[PDB]
Amino acid sequence: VGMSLLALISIFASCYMLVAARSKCLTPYALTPGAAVPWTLGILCCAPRAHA
């Protein structure tokens, strides 16, 4: 149970960082403009999961 609980917490933490990184890098591009470098800089920088 301890090993499984540790495994989940790290996965949850890792998922937590990924979403946070998406928010930090997506908010600047999407404040006034809809412009997100169609996956040229959408993949390397952060999550390209923005709709656009």
Binding site: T27, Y29, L31, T32
Partner: protein
């Protein structure tokens, strides 16, 4: 004296006079299918369309972007990503944009009125007020601008929340 027939009178309604517990504390505006509203301020968003909308609260930019409906897309205000250094239009006065620094006449304006959708001399938007720094020389102010694509921000040293 009376040379004021610019976009301020044309739009006249993008200001939503954000009011916390009924006390006007900030001013929200709109730019290109988006809604601008300082994050550090708070209050009422009475407009039902805007009231039920989710904003970001990035402190690095201290802005509340949005996706406004078509209910404002004609009650809007054009913008710019370029700054022809000089004089720009303001609500409570004027804007004196020195080389890479915003400022207003010393003691002019007031604090607790963040939004203030500063206007350009062409009848468009180039800046939004965030703060104010009253140095011995004159009054600077923290504001937000827009690069080619990046929506950046500037905060001069000694500037407090306004």
């Amino acid at each position: 004296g009376k040379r004021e027939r610019m976009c301020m009178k044309i739009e006249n309604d993008c200001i939503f006079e954000v009011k916390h517990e009924g006390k006007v504390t900030g001013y929200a505006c709109l730019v290109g299918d988006k809604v601008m509203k300082p994050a550090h301020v708070k209050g009422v968003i009475d407009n039902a369309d805007l009231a039920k909308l989710a904003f970001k609260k990035s402190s690095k930019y201290d802005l509340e972007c949005a996706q406004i409906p078509v209910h404002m897309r004609s009650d809007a205000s054009k913008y710019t990503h370029e700054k022809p250094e000089g004089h720009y239009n303001w609500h409570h006065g004027a804007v004196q944009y020195s080389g890479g620094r915003f400022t207003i006449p010393t003691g002019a304006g007031k604090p607790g009125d963040s939004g203030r959708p500063i206007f350009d001399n062409k009848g468009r938007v180039v800046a939004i007020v965030l703060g104010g720094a009253n140095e011995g020389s004159r009054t600077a102010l923290s504001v937000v601008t827009w690069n080619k694509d990046m929506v950046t921000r500037v905060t001069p040293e000694g500037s407090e929340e306004w």
